[PDB]
Swiss-Prot record:
One of its GO terms (cellular component) is cytosol. GO terms for biological process: cytoplasmic translation; negative regulation of mRNA splicing, via spliceosome; rRNA processing. There is a cross-link at residues 14, 45, 75 (Glycyl lysine isopeptide (Lys-Gly) (interchain with G-Cter in ubiquitin)). Belongs to the eukaryotic ribosomal protein eL30 family. Its main location: cytoplasm. It holds the Pfam family Ribosomal_L7Ae. This is Large ribosomal subunit protein eL30. One of its GO terms (molecular function) is structural constituent of ribosome. Component of the large ribosomal subunit (LSU). Mature yeast ribosomes consist of a small (40S) and a large (60S) subunit. The 40S small subunit contains 1 molecule of ribosomal RNA (18S rRNA) and 33 different proteins (encoded by 57 genes). The large 60S subunit contains 3 rRNA molecules (25S, 5.8S and 5S rRNA) and 46 different proteins (encoded by 81 genes). It comes from Saccharomyces cerevisiae (strain ATCC 204508 / S288c) (Baker's yeast). Component of the ribosome, a large ribonucleoprotein complex responsible for the synthesis of proteins in the cell. The small ribosomal subunit (SSU) binds messenger RNAs (mRNAs) and translates the encoded message by selecting cognate aminoacyl-transfer RNA (tRNA) molecules. The large subunit (LSU) contains the ribosomal catalytic site termed the peptidyl transferase center (PTC), which catalyzes the formation of peptide bonds, thereby polymerizing the amino acids delivered by tRNAs into a polypeptide chain. Present with 59300 molecules/cell in log phase SD medium. Keywords: Cytoplasm, Isopeptide bond, Ribonucleoprotein, Ribosomal protein, Ubl conjugation.
RNA sequence: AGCUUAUCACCCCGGAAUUGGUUUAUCCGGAGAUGGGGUCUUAUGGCUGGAAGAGGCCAGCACCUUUGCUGGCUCCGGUGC
């Protein structure tokens, strides 16, 4: 499912974690996608799409909290929002998601 | 009273697994650490003014007395379940 395609871009294309990075990354247009965990509060969430819509960047919502999102990416620690800098062999940018 | 001074807390850069900081007592970190640089409360503490002409310890003077003058030092530290 959506976990497998994340598990392939982890080493085929550069990416980033955290929140301050995602806000910084999309400023110059280097972000093609972001992922928002359901655990984050709406006010914290409401930033991302407003910055994303200014960059014409699609926003993908994640079914689950930040605890599980970090495991899906491949890091033992947890991540609230994930931004994809550029996809590799994966097709996360161009898919039903 | 002037200058100055701490934990805690917060801010800018930065980005983390070969996970790391860390209290006597294991909490914290992508809701962003460790690190580098700063801000803040001023309990407390330090120098200075108050204030050494104050207080204290000592030597001479002679006053049936009422009393005083001349004077010196009033300094530098250390440790602690």
């Amino acid at each position: 499912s959506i976990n497998q395609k994340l598990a392939l871009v982890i080493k085929s294309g550069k990416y980033t974690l955290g929140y301050k990075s995602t806000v910084k990354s999309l400023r110059q247009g280097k972000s093609k996608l972001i992922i928002i965990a359901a655990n984050t509060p709406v006010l914290r969430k409401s930033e991302l799409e407003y910055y994303a819509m200014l960059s014409k960047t699609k926003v993908y919502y994640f079914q689950g909290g930040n605890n599980e999102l970090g495991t899906a990416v491949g890091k033992l620690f947890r991540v609230g929002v994930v931004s994809i800098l550029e996809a590799g062999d994966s097709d996360i940018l161009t898919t039903l998601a």
